[PDB]
Amino acid sequence: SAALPSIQLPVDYNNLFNEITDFLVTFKQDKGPKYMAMLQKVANRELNSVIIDLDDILQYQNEKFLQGTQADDLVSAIQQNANHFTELFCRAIDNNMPLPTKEIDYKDDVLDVILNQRRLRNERMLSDRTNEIRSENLMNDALREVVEDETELFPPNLTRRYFLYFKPLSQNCA
């Protein structure tokens, strides 16, 4: 630990991950949540690009602070270190991705069918391993943990079709 020292920094990525997830789920200013609807459109293979409006994040922060709840400065953290927050947003989106309501109809892009095949295959592997370990008869949370540790899935990096981009703050609002 002496070769690679450590530094404490004001940023806490776990709290910011929670803030990102909450912002994605519960932003309504622009009926339903804006980004949830965008993710639904992505799932139906309509939109290939998710545009994270930083003005939305700023308004979310202002709403949270105005009501008194403490919300960390997500916009400033994004501006200071943008590269990491790309992957943070990408993983938060990948967790909250809904399921398609319109299946493959022989006219879908080959990328989409390959992604669907990979997703179904890794789900099948996970379920099969769960069934085997359950049948071994040695809570389902521990079973899920052991099967996800013991299986080699297609990583989530290879099952996402959308692209992630950030829109800078409008000068007039800021």
Binding site: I133, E136, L138, M139, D141, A142, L143, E145, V146
Partner: peptide, 27 residues
């Protein structure tokens, strides 16, 4: 052993050693 420990955790392990006890003919 890993499987059993994780399963029974509900209310890392080193490489286990095998001990072989036999009753066969002794040279």
């Amino acid at each position: 052993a890993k499987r059993i420990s994780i399963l029974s955790r509900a209310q890392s392990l080193p490489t286990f050693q095998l001990i072989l006890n036999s009753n066969a003919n002794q040279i």
